[PDB]
């Protein structure tokens, strides 16, 4: 039974891995890369400024 | 998963963290990458030796500060890797994860977790090349230690510190020598005596994975993982992660041993290391030395080597006994790295090919094996009452040695040959079948005393253990103390004397 | 406790303490072990007794 359950976990990390493959799909699929773009320059002027 | 989670969300908000600070605008580009070394431009202020964080993922060690070009090696596969993706400066010298918790655990190169136990803590990151203690922070092998198989061990002992080496052919067990080599730390380890414990940690340097699972298995299985840290590198892992493994285990005997408790450690076949360095050598740029292997072999196994000492009280009177383990081909005791190593090395115990299969599951040339300590730092039970048994076991050696065509001359000389034939055939201490500090002596003992040499020497195979268990179950006093006392008394000797009259008899 | 939702962990410790006589010893030696005891001290009573009348003889 532990063996069972330690191989379930590890499909749990495996299953939330092959859902991310999807979910960083979306975020190209999905122009949020133009809502990211500003956050990208935002954090780079701050990095920029930091010194 | 929720607690994944957590740790992505954590691992995440670590790498927006050091995305806003990157401080990363001139750090270098990857020029060239090939058989697990690349070469990359920029990196202009990198340190020397100091671990490279590359785009693709994997990353490796920088040796090579080139004029322009610094050569970093990569630790990992080449797939993934290409030219121009950015090398990062991690901005320190490679570090390995170290401190007690690493327990049970096998890590990676640098200390990667492996097994898929998640994190182990950490008392200490500790650079993978430290300098080792001199002379006044160095002291003598005051404290003897067990080698678990008798295994000519009351021979030729392995104390504080005492840098024993061995060697043998493919498939030669010398693996299963160093197994049963820890699994002795389970009868003083496993207790709480840190006078006794010494915590080994084995090495897995170029072994076939499938290996490293039987280690672990046998590890688990006899209990061995409660006080053996395998530190991995895989024959499918990348080259440089084999050469940097054996600098790994430094770290690691480092993070133990320099708290102040006697701890050991035993590196895996020390070949593969050696051929790591050949690769890591013959590969980047370096120009080849002798026997067609990198120069600097005799520095990189010092290096490995000379970071084990017995450290003195003024350093906590700690150490860090090393069982380094080299290979060769076709049992060769003359060669390049096999040489240069016994001239580094301790101590040597040879492991042949004819006896590998002729006579004995251990097959220890007891002969050619040697530790530049017997006297000091030996088991005071094999010592300090069985001295005289030592140099019986050195004289019966020799009388064995003369064994092979000449005639008999007279009986004093076949008497010799019987009685330490039938030791010979006694001494094999069966694998994972560390029990020794108990009846050490009793071997050569009762041979000098006509009480085992008057049984027949193939019987002994049972003969050994009735003694053995009638000392335990009816000797019980006397073979406790000589497990404690530390000594085997003369009046010890006859008691002794009169339990080997009971096993003679029943 | 390692074992989160094993379900039957509940019902292996059930079985467990539940299986704690699996069965009796067996001294049913009660008679044979008195006649046994009888032949043997006879025999050896009128070995001894024999033995001690050859010494006297």
Known sequence: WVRYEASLRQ????????????????????????????????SEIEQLLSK | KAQPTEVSSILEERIKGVSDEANLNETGRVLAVGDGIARVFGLNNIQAEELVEFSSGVKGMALN????????????????????????????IVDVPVGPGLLGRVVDALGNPIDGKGPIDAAGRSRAQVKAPGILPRRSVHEPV???????????????????????????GKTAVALDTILNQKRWNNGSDESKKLYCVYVAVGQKRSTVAQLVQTLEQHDAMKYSIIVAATASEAAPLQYLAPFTAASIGEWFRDNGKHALIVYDDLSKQAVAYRQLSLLLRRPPGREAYPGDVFYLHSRLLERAAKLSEKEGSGSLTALPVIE????????????????ITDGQIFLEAELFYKGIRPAINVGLSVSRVGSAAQVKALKQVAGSLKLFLAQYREVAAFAQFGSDLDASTKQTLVRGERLTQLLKQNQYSPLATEEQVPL?????????????????????????????????????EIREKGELSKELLASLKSATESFVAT | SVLKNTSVIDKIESYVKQYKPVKIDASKQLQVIESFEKHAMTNAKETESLVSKELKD
């Open chain 2, 146 to 172: 067990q080698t678990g198989l008798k295994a000519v061990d009351a021979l030729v002992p392995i104390g504080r510190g005492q840098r024993e080496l061995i060697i043998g052919d493919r498939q030669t």
């Open chain 2, 444 to 480: 050569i003992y009762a041979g000098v005393n006509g009480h085992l040499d008057g049984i027949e020497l193939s019987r002994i195979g049972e003969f050994e253990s009735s003694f053995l268990s009638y000392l335990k179950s009816n000797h019980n006093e006397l073979l406790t």
């Open chain 1, 11 to 42: 499909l749990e990390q495996r299953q939330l891995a092959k859902s991310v493959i999807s979910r960083v799909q979306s975020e190209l699929g999905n122009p949020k890369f133009q809502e990211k773009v500003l956050q990208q320059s935002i």
């Open chain 2, 65 to 92: 500060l080139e004029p322009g070009q610094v050569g970093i090696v990569l630790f990992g596969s080449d797939r993934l890797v290409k030219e121009g993706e950015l090398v990062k400066r991690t901005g320190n």
């Open chain 2, 328 to 343: 060769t081909q076709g049992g060769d005791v003359s060669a390049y790295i096999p040489t240069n190593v016994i001239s």
